[PDB]
Write a protein that binds this ligand. Structure first.
Ligand SMILES: Nc1nc2c(ncn2[C@@H]2O[C@H](COP(=O)(O)OP(=O)(O)OP(=O)(O)O)[C@@H](O)[C@H]2O)c(=O)[nH]1
Ligand SMILES: [Mg+2]
Ligand SMILES: [Mg+2]
Ligand SMILES: [Zn+2]
Lengths: 101, 168, 19
RNA sequence: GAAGCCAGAGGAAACUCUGGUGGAGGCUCGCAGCGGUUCUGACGUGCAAAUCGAUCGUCAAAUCUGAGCAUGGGGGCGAAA
RNA sequence: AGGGAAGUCGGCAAAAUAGAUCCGUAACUUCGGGAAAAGGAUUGGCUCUAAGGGUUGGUAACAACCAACUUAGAACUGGUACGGACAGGGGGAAUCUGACUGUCUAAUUAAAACAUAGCAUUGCG
RNA sequence: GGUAAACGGCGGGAGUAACUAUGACUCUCUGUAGCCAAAUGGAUUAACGAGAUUCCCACUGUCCCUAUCUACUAUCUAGCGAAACCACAGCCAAGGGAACGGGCUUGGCAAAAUCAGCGGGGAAAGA
RNA sequence: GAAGCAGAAUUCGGUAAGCGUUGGAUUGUUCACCCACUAAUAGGGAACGUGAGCUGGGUUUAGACCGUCGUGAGACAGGUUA
């Protein structure tokens, strides 16, 4: 079940994107940017328990390992294995390219 | 009774009770009567109008609403600590928590809330919120509600505090 | 007024007053 | 999930703890039933001289209900308006 | 759409929560409760695995036959949804008030009103 | 004479010369957490409530600031078909001593017959 | 138009109603004062010289409680709820 389903598509209910999760996994600097965006004291478990693949904070380690066996985490892992959609892929889909000399 | 004897020439004497809000004027009248004759509530401003209560044949008691004389040196923090206002209708109650921590000894607060090891007021509020389950969506501490609870306990005699008398 | 005798007054036994 | 009951670990015993069983309560959510809290409700020469919709209280009892009978106005009856 | 009570005497109305499994649950207290407190993780389909039984027959700890619903685990797979309709607690901090369960003004007032158990008094051999 | 001492009255405490009720006449009266009580020192009473009140999170068309969609009416047609109300009628301005005009006076004006809506006024509240 | 009115911002006065004159908080209360935006947040009438658009307070049928007075039925200096 999804809480408040009629307003899930609103901009103020937006979640982090798959490509941004990919940059967070590949570079810790981008993940550090996303962490310094939020305030640590308002985070579940003081921000100590974070799943990068789902981009979600959890209240405890037992909650985090309970999340990892769930199917939303497995869907995120499968989508990460398949590959997020980027502007390079969108450009290759039309056969455009960048000429820099 | 002595005042009534001194004013035996008159038909009766009137004894009006004045003071700050929530000092116990209606409570004093109820105690003297031995019966709940005046309304009593821990919130300030329960008594709004003047009320006559016949204590004996020649003694009347007059309940009055609480007054706060205006002073240029009084702070809203001072008024909230002396019990003028209701803490539910104030903005950002966590700013008055340092005043409460200054007034109340640390060990008294520790034995009151079974909490120890805070470094400042917002840490104390967060620890007490996590201890008492005062959590919003996402498990974040509800320091606003915790501050209102602490202020209400300070006002209504659940946390020990007093002002010592000046030495001679 | 009379002599002030507060010896028989029992104070309120608050939670913070207990070790 | 109350007594009663079973097993284990203790404790000199009296007792303690753990895991079960058990199915009590003018307990509780809630269907019927009974009732009638709320809606800028419908309706206002109405379907109706008190009805309709949603919502609500209660639902194993101080619960609901049929028939026969008794109490008849200076009266009766009344968990008393 | 964006803002989220700026509306109004007043969050009136609406929305949000809702089934089930698991983690976890404070103050106060008559120790019985509060409590479903609060706050979180998950829920589709398919293919499997494991566990929970009965009858007959001289270490039978073995053979034969028969049968039903639950419980847990794993892989795969669709997704904007997985209690996919239906059904279905918003929650919390407090104050006053009446002990509660219950009852009444059929047709404007369901309540701090009445009754209730408990307590106290009076009369009568 | 004794009290349910219920209602009720009663500021205390000492003396005396009264000597009993009523006396009467003087004098003066202002521990940052303890001690004591058979763990507690309470009513700041738990649960319970279609009781009344303030606030916080979430939530949303309550609002900014309105727009759009559906069904049933309202609309038209066929059939069927009342009632409330009704002195007579219904455009206004100024004046009309009795602080009131729809009709009088002086002016502005003023064109058949109609349909759908609206609630200023007249009507309309078992008023 | 005037003023030590240098400029800027102004102050006083005159003609003028063509055109604007906002958004909020506070009911332990004569709801009136605060806060900000703005060019500015001017004041009144057609009700209040009784009076059927809607909805809150003066405001008050019948239910109920507390305070004052009364022997009591009850009334009120009053306060609360539907
Ligand atoms: N512990 C303790 N609390 C008291 C005492 N006297 C009064 N209180 C509490 O103080 C609270 C406030 O007193 P109130 O009865 O409301 O009288 P008030 O001072 O006139 O307050 P307002 O009516 O609002 O002006 C009451 O709710 C009592 O519970 C006391 O002697 N001891
Ligand atoms: Mg008070
Ligand atoms: Mg008072
Ligand atoms: Zn994850």
């Amino acid at each position: 079940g999804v809480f408040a389903k009629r307003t899930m598509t609103k901009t103020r209910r937006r979640l982090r994107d798959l490509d941004q999760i990919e940059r967070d996994l590949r570079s810790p600097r981008h993940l550090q940017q996303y962490k310094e965006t939020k305030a640590a004291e308002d985070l579940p478990g003081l921000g100590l328990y974070y799943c990068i693949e789902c981009a979600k904070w959890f209240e405890s380690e037992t909650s985090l390992v309970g999340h990892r066996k769930g199917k939303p985490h497995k869907r995120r892992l499968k989508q990460l294995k398949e590959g997020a959609y980027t502007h390079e892929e969108a450009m290759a889909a039309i056969g455009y390219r960048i000429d820099n000399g | 009774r002595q005042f009534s004897v001194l004013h035996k020439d008159r038909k009766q004497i009137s004894v009006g009770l004045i003071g700050y809000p929530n000092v116990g004027k209606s409570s004093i009248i109820n105690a003297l009567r031995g019966k709940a004759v005046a309304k009593v509530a821990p919130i300030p401003g329960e008594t709004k109008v003047w009320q006559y209560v016949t204590l004996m044949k020649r003694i009347y008691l007059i309940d009055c609403p609480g007054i706060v004389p205006p002073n240029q040196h009084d702070t809203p923090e001072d008024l909230l600590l002396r019990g003028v206002v209701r803490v539910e209708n104030v903005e950002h109650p966590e700013q008055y928590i340092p005043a409460v921590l200054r007034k109340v000894k640390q060990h008294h607060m520790e034995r009151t809330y079974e909490l120890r090891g805070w470094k400042d007021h917002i840490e104390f509020l967060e620890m007490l919120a996590r201890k008492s389950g005062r959590l919003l969506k996402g498990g974040e501490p509800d320091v606003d509600g915790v501050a209102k609870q602490v202020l209400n306990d300070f006002m209504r005699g659940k946390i020990p505090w007093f002002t010592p008398a000046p030495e001679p | 007024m009379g002599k002030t005798d507060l010896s028989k007054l029992q104070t309120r036994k608050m939670k913070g007053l207990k070790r």
